[PDB]
Design a protein around this ligand. Structure first.
Ligand SMILES: [K+]
Length: 191
RNA sequence: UUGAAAAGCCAGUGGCGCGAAGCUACCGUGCGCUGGAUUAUGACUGAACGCCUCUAAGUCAGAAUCCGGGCUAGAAGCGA
């Protein structure tokens, strides 16, 4: 029914710099740089500075927006929160190898930017996966048959994990019985 | 049949054997191709709906599929 004003605000930690211009959000922190293009959202983004204190707030609002349009405000705020988390703490995904008979042989290429899977269900084919930008994959030493993906972009890290998982799908078998694969087991922050 | 020999000719290709050349047969030989976008499907982050959610915004992989490329032709189209 076109609610007049739907607004939501988020606090910004003092250790992160943020710039907004034409719905282009630039985030800077100790771990590096992140960028997002929110041009596809018909929302108004504003950065409020507290002169007396010096703190930062990001306010996103929609005017005369329907429910569908208003649903994007929280999405944008969560995306900005994820950017801040990635630039301050970073993102770490953990994957575990699951197999019944054939151990999965994983080889990490140079730079921790590519992975080779060789013995999935005793298959002679070699599966190649390349990590996305800013995401590095390593083989854990404290946990058996575990892969650690570290990055600054939650979306890129999760997409790399999804690529690894989907590259090892079982076919022509009852997947309920043949549970072999590589699956995401934990999501968290590097620090 | 030309007197004979030799050498020819007629029987509309006289008949038979071999027969080069050309043509020709899976009856012989050579060759027949790879970038993008996507369907179904499976997923990422993510609200709506403080949780959840492949979906609402955004995003990924994806086919004897489509498009392009390659091959054939080359327009009251054109260049040096
Ligand atoms: K989800």
């Amino acid at each position: 029914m076109k609610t007049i004003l739907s607004s939501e605000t988020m606090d910004i930690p003092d250790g992160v710099n943020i710039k907004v211009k034409a719905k282009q959000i630039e985030v800077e922190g100790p771990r590096g740089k992140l960028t997002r293009n929110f041009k596809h959202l018909n929302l108004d983004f504003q950065l409020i500075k507290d002169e007396e204190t010096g703190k930062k707030k990001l306010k996103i609002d929609a005017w005369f927006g329907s429910r569908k349009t208003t649903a994007a405000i929280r999405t944008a705020l969560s995306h900005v929160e994820n950017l801040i988390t990635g630039v301050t703490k970073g993102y770490r995904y953990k994957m575990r190898f699951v197999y019944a008979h054939f151990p999965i042989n994983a080889s990490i290429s140079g730079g921790n930017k590519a992975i080779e899977i060789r013995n999935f269900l005793g298959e002679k084919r070699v599966r190649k996966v390349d990590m996305l930008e800013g995401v590095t994959v390593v083989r854990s030493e404290k946990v058996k048959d575990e892969l650690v993906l570290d990055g600054n972009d939650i979306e890129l890290v999760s997409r790399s994990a999804a690529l690894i998982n989907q590259k090892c799908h079982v076919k022509n078998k009852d997947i309920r019985k043949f549970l072999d694969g590589i699956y995401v087991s934990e999501k968290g922050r590097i620090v």
